[PDB]
Amino acid sequence: GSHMVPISFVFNRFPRMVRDLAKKMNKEVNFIMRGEDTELDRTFVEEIGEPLLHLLRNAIDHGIEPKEERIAKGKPPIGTLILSARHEGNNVVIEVEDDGRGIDKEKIIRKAIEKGLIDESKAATLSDQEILNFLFVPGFSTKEGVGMDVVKNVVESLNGSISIESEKDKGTKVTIRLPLT
Amino acid sequence: SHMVPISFVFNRFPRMVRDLAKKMNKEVNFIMRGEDTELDRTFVEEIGEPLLHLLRNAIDHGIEPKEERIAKGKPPIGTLILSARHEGNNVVIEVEDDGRGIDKEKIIRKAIEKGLIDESKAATLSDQEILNFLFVPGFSTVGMDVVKNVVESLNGSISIESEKDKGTKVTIRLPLT
Ligand SMILES: Nc1ncnc2c1ncn2[C@@H]1O[C@H](COP(=O)(O)OP(=O)(O)CP(=O)(O)O)[C@@H](O)[C@H]1O
Ligand SMILES: Nc1ncnc2c1ncn2[C@@H]1O[C@H](COP(=O)(O)OP(=O)(O)CP(=O)(O)O)[C@@H](O)[C@H]1O
Ligand SMILES: [Mn+2]
Ligand SMILES: [Mn+2]
């Protein structure tokens, strides 16, 4: 790689943003960053900021439940949000994981049925990955050009890839793979 | 008035964009937003060609070849975004690319060649004054001048924004009722 620079050039700006977001949304969250010394193409560093911030915001908004709710639910009172970078072969892997309520998969199914994309019989045969992928279909999720869409497009314009996994009341993990320059 | 989703106009673009990019050997990720945005049905036939021209301009003149994108420290794949939405009592349509931007120096040279401006007045022209030459009838060698004419024909307005090596954004606002 030619113009390598530590991912910290983009990471160090998140602790402040996370705390303020958590305060505004009345959420209690412990933010952990890992692999801040991971080197990657400077172009990626300058472009991956917007996408990551959105995933972080998603986690704080839709993921982590208010402290009172986590308590009522029987989970540790403070939520955990982890942002990490690491090497996997010739790929830099960035992950945003929260231990929140998890993506509501039924909600997605209901929305897909409403849009006429699938019917009830078919909906019952879909796999979790199949359900979660609806989140990447442009125009699927209602807006207010932000969203999972913009995240995937930006990541893919860097020749990157993005995947999602989630478990009810367990949390959600978004994974971004960036290529070695 | 009688409305229809703007998808009637947008539907054919993905294929044309894909084929054009492939022809001019450019890597382009085409994004279309708000295809459900409605507009006057009598606008469909008229606004199609102008929009296609703006998309072609972005692919041909905007988005740079891969090696150029890399040299400039930009994402390898260029991004072309076509969007429509309702604002106030109008339909707003935008065509944006993150390419090399409009060659303003080239526009001024053309304006002088066409007798539209004396060279003694070129040094102080504002960016808007420069880009506006594109709307002067006969400026193009369908061209931007024709696009502006058609938009005016629909009682709407058009504006351009562009920054060197950053990109170009063309915004069209058409009246609803
Ligand atoms: N970390 C997370 N935990 C739980 N659900 C999540 C999540 N991240 C995303 N989601 C779910 O996925 C759906 C869409 O996220 P997306 O980022 O595309 O849209 P948005 O609903 O957040 C509105 P916008 O992106 O325009 O602010 C969300 O509305 C939510 O239901
Ligand atoms: N998205 C964009 N990015 C960069 N330059 C653009 C552009 N859209 C237009 N231009 C530039 O502005 C000048 C004029 O565009 P206009 O559409 O009026 O004419 P045209 O001469 O390009 C017709 P054609 O090239 O289709 O034969 C172009 O010649 C090009 O240099
Ligand atoms: Mn969101
Ligand atoms: Mn042209």
Side-chain angles (χ1 to χ4, degrees), chain B residues 9-51:
Chain B
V9 178
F10 287 21
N11 274 326
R12 65 169 183 139
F13 292 153
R15 185 169 297 279
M16 295 177 98
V17 167
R18 181 169 62 244
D19 296 340
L20 220 61
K22 204 169 300 179
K23 177 183 177 185
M24 298 174 273
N25 209 293
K26 308 288 188 71
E27 295 90 38
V28 186
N29 178 40
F30 186 48
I31 300 177
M32 295 206 306
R33 300 168 175 175
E35 55 176 54
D36 287 345
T37 303
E38 306 208 308
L39 77 174
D40 187 335
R41 74 184 175 194
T42 60
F43 286 1
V44 178
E45 209 84 78
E46 300 185 68
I47 198 70
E49 174 173 43
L51 285 176

Side-chain angles (χ1 to χ4, degrees), chain A residues 54-64 96 98 100-104 107-108 111 135-136 141-142 145-151 164 166 171-174:
Chain A
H54 195 75
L55 297 185
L56 291 170
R57 183 170 61 200
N58 272 349
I60 297 168
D61 178 11
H62 313 298
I64 305 301
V96 173
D98 69 72
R101 56 174 66 88
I103 292 164
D104 181 345
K107 182 175 187 178
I108 297 171
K111 283 180 169 176
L135 255 30
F136 290 129
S141 300
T142 63
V146 306
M148 234 71 94
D149 298 357
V150 190
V151 177
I164 300 180
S166 178
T172 297
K173 172 190 281 193
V174 180

Side-chain angles (χ1 to χ4, degrees), chain B residues 53 56-57 60-61 140 142-144:
Chain B
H53 181 65
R56 189 174 195 301
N57 274 351
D60 185 1
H61 304 289
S140 74
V142 171
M144 188 63 82

Side-chain angles (χ1 to χ4, degrees), chain B residues 128-158:
Chain B
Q128 279 294 295
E129 274 179 321
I130 299 171
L131 296 182
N132 249 79
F133 283 129
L134 268 43
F135 299 147
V136 175
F139 188 83
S140 74
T141 58
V142 171
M144 188 63 82
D145 53 345
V146 171
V147 172
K148 189 278 189 308
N149 192 64
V150 173
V151 174
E152 294 299 309
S153 207
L154 296 178
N155 205 38
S157 54
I158 183 176

Side-chain angles (χ1 to χ4, degrees), chain A residues 42-62:
Chain A
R42 69 189 189 200
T43 297
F44 296 172
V45 178
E46 307 171 1
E47 298 285 340
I48 209 72
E50 358 130 43
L52 291 174
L53 185 58
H54 195 75
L55 297 185
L56 291 170
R57 183 170 61 200
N58 272 349
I60 297 168
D61 178 11
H62 313 298

Side-chain angles (χ1 to χ4, degrees), chain A residues 20-73:
Chain A
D20 299 328
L21 287 167
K23 176 171 50 184
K24 167 184 172 177
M25 301 182 194
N26 296 311
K27 302 300 185 66
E28 197 72 62
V29 292
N30 173 45
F31 184 46
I32 306 179
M33 290 192 309
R34 299 166 175 165
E36 318 79 345
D37 59 323
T38 298
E39 299 268 349
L40 73 162
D41 192 277
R42 69 189 189 200
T43 297
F44 296 172
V45 178
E46 307 171 1
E47 298 285 340
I48 209 72
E50 358 130 43
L52 291 174
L53 185 58
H54 195 75
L55 297 185
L56 291 170
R57 183 170 61 200
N58 272 349
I60 297 168
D61 178 11
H62 313 298
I64 305 301
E65 318 93 318
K67 185 173 64 179
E68 53 88 14
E69 185 175 2
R70 291 179 64 90
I71 289 184
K73 294 176 71 175

